[PDB]
Symmetry: C3
Subunit: 87 residues, 3 copies
């Protein structure tokens, strides 16, 4: 089982991505309880990065299954596929 972690803001918000048995899922903290997020994509390995534009968070999740990495994007309104390609 393999994790990636990100955080942002003053609360802060935390997102932990877990790769287990070719599935990546998301646990979320926003200052109250941990909860399961919307992110569900295939992968045996994950890494993640985020930034703020004002108060709006932007997340990029790099999901790898075998020899292929797909980027998944949060920009305020659902997970969308990004334009990232490997070597």
């Amino acid at each position: 089982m393999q994790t990636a972690a990100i955080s942002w803001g003053t609360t802060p918000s935390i997102r932990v991505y877990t790769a287990n048995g070719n599935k990546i899922t998301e646990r979320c903290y926003d200052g109250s309880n941990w909860y399961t997020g919307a992110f569900n994509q295939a992968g045996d390995n994950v890494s993640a990065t985020c930034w703020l534009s004002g108060s709006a968070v932007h997340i990029r999740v790099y999901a790898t299954s075998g020899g292929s990495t797909t980027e998944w994007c949060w920009d305020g309104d659902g997970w969308t596929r990004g334009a990232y390609t490997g070597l």
Copy 2:
């Protein structure tokens, strides 16, 4: 052997967590020598994130042993168990 890296400030401070044979340990840089930090917990996989409240650092380490992730918290005065749970 697997690592996680975080940094903060402009010095910078860096922490590198290393999972080796089910033990996670911490190496630290604050502007002079690398040194062994107080973090010592079980795990074969590690991720970490951090934030600053003014000058005070807050670190969260996600230590995974098998199919269980535990969150470890630095808030200025020792490593404490965090409230994180998985799915």
Copy 3:
């Protein structure tokens, strides 16, 4: 195959490091196309962190081959070795 991701600035810039078959490479984004960066070092495991000095980026990549981690540094003038040692 294993990745590490970092980002900085408002654009933002992103760097994704991929460990594949004991080789770590780098895919870069700066606001248009994804492109291949200069990073090329050995490892089966990678972590990375970055910070700004003003708006100029400093990157540290932790490349692990078997039992030992080597730090690689970007400070604006090519990839250089760092002084990191383990336990």
